[PDB]
């Protein structure tokens, strides 16, 4: 719509920004840990070479 900006007359900008930042950081950490536990792991997969051997 054209009046969507009026949402800022209902929601406080500061709280919205703080919540967005915190949620994005926590989500990034969570997704990185979740992908680390699958077979898509990029650290402990001995590519290009294994450095402990």
């Amino acid at each position: 719509n054209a009046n969507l900006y009026k949402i800022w007359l209902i929601l406080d900008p500061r709280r919205v920004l703080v919540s967005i930042v915190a949620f994005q950081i926590v989500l990034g950490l969570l997704i990185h840990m979740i992908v680390l536990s699958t077979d898509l792991n990029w650290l402990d997969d001995n590519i290009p070479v294994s450095y402990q051997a």
Binding site: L4, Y5, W8, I10, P13
Partner: protein, 42 residues
């Protein structure tokens, strides 16, 4: 109003918020394209 903001302040905040959100989404899209080029998952 509830937040104490006038109409002009709301319009300006909405414009800048949309710009920043679009930039963030563009960065995310670029990163995901790079990841798909490296390690396809589907």
């Amino acid at each position: 109003s509830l937040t104490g903001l006038t109409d002009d302040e709301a319009k300006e905040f909405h414009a800048i918020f949309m710009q920043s959100m679009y930039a963030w989404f563009g960065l995310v899209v670029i990163a995901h394209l790079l990841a798909w080029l490296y390690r396809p998952w589907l």
